[PDB]
């Protein structure tokens, strides 16, 4: 459900999260393809790279 960022990530497209290292991303929906959806920073269920986070 929640994950923690290992590195800063900056949204490159409208449908992506932006977060800083150590951030807690919530309500994570895992799927195939190396990107998951989650909640952070007022954005809901947007994409982020799964290799950016640990659980």
């Amino acid at each position: 459900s929640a994950v923690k960022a290992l590195f800063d990530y900056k949204a490159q497209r409208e449908d992506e999260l932006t977060f800083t290292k150590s951030a807690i991303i919530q309500n994570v929906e895992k799927q195939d393809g190396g990107w998951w959806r989650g909640d952070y920073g007022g954005k809901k269920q947007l994409w982020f790279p799964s290799n950016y986070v640990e659980e």
Partner: peptide, 10 residues
């Protein structure tokens, strides 16, 4: 040393 995001297709 940040990982490469798997590049997204159009």
């Amino acid at each position: 040393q940040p990982p490469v995001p798997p590049q997204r297709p159009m």
